[PDB]
Design a protein around this ligand. Sequence first.
Ligand SMILES: Nc1ncnc2c1ncn2[C@@H]1O[C@H](CSCC[C@H](N)C(=O)O)[C@@H](O)[C@H]1O
Ligand SMILES: Cc1ncccc1-c1cc(O)c2nc[nH]c(=O)c2c1
Ligand SMILES: [Cl-]
Ligand SMILES: [Mg+2]
Length: 213
Amino acid sequence: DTKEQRILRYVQQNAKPGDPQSVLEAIDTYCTQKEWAMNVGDAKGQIMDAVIREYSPSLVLELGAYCGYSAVRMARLLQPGARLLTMEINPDCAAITQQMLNFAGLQDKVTILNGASQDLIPQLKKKYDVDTLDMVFLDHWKDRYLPDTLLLEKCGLLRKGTVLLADNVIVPGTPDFLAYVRGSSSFECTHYSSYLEYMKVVDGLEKAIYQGP
Ligand SMILES: Nc1ncnc2c1ncn2[C@@H]1O[C@H](CSCC[C@H](N)C(=O)O)[C@@H](O)[C@H]1O
Ligand SMILES: Cc1ncccc1-c1cc(O)c2nc[nH]c(=O)c2c1
Ligand SMILES: [Cl-]
Ligand SMILES: [Mg+2]
């Protein structure tokens, strides 16, 4: 088996079906005690939780699903009727994420989109019936953060007040994205210093609120 299959099995055997918090705790435990994995983690996750509660977004887009940790984390805080779309290029991980969501009982709130973000983003309006996004969580691959931000704007998916929340802006680091949003009059940016998941290594989230053209 893979690490990702081992994480899912650990949740299935150490969490309670229908209890998102137990799912997050099981993943955290496994990845602290057994095998590190690139989930956003509890330290940065607590910052995400505070942001989701502040904005109560109706429609969230996540870029990069992995095993579903962040999708569980966000979807558990959504209001009835609110929705999350999560894009995942690796089909093995999409299959893990679906099973994780099902186990957590959050499958009604979350849709997996299979493919590369750069291919799926241009389909969101016509194929997926999206108007604009309330929040975007960028956590796929560092070199896609800036191009996909620009693509979201081109496609008409951002509105005044859309919240972009980007993981890993320190480690691995996203210097072109940070320089761009922090220099742009079209974003209002805040940095939330934290720690790399499961490690005593500094990292951070960036929040960049879109202002309009
Ligand atoms: N262009 C792209 N589009 C979609 N998914 C991508 C991508 N490039 C990488 N990925 C996916 O992005 C993921 C990064 S890890 C995501 C972790 C998750 N947000 C969490 O916190 O639980 C991987 O599963 C990888 O396959
Ligand atoms: C894998 C890794 N090694 C050392 C340091 C950091 C990482 C790391 C951590 C993350 O949170 C990631 N999130 C999304 N996508 C990634 O590529 C990614 C990589
Ligand atoms: Cl952590
Ligand atoms: Mg990350």
